[PDB]
């Protein structure tokens, strides 16, 4: 698993390693090792209750754009292994849970 992060006060704009081919719809989760995790943003525009405005929202129009994940208000929870749960038309089912990315915070 490849780490990618940045020091505090700067947004770690991790972009999904997968490339969007065709129509896209991504799912975003706040993971926890060995326990039950939750979801943060499961669509290009969905902002469920309890989710602040810290997340950037890119509408899925004019195919060719990239799905990038940026976060703020960093805490202990976000260091867990993120999973970019993506679905695209041509590639079909994604049996893997996407590119497993982890956030490393030190200071």
């Amino acid at each position: 698993v490849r780490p990618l992060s940045v020091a505090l006060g700067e947004t770690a704009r991790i972009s999904c390693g997968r490339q969007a081919l065709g129509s896209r719809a991504v799912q975003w989760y706040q993971h926890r090792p060995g326990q039950a995790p939750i979801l943060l943003i499961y669509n290009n525009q969905d902002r469920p209750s309890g989710i602040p405005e810290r997340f950037s929202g890119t509408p899925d129009i004019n195919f060719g754009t990239r799905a990038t994940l940026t976060i703020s208000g960093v805490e202990a929870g976000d260091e867990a292994d993120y999973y970019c749960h993506m679905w695209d038309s041509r590639s079909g089912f994604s049996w893997s849970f996407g590119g497993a990315t982890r956030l490393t915070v030190l200071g």
Binding site: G22, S23, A25, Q27, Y29, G34, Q35, A36, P37, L39, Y42, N43, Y83, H85, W87, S89, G92, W95, S96, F97, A100
Partner: protein
């Protein structure tokens, strides 16, 4: 609300049948599809196989129905059952609710649409180690 609690044996003899059940409350067969999460301490994330609401069994295509899934709905102890187990497929059996939503990009009659799969609730899971 959805509550999770497993009742797995915790120990399995090699090449023997398993029955890992999960207790769920507040819902029935039709509302939630039932997938299962594969996980282990310091291991990857996968779907080895899972059951549909209509008792249809869907598996990892590389797995090709190595295990057979049956369950019980009256007890709400929906079961993922493993046949001919191995340390390769040793994983904690999260009981996961599955819901489907669809993104339509083209004419529906032609078949141009796909489901964007939502993952809301994760099971607690049980740990089984092969002897």
């Amino acid at each position: 609300q959805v509550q999770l609690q497993e009742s797995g044996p915790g120990l399995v003899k090699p090449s023997e049948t398993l029955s890992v059940t999960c207790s769920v409350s507040g819902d029935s067969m039709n509302n939630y599809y039932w997938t299962w999460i594969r996980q282990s301490p310091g291991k990857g994330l996968e779907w080895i196989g899972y059951i549909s609401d209509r008792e249809s069994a869907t598996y990892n295509p590389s797995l090709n129905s190595r295990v057979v899934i049956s369950r019980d709905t009256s007890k709400n102890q929906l079961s993922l059952k493993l046949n001919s187990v191995t340390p390769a497929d040793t994983a904690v059996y999260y009981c996961a609710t599955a819901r489907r939503g669809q993104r339509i990009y083209g004419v529906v009659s032609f078949g141009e649409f796909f489901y964007y799969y939502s993952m809301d609730v994760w099971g607690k899971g049980t740990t089984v180690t092969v002897s």
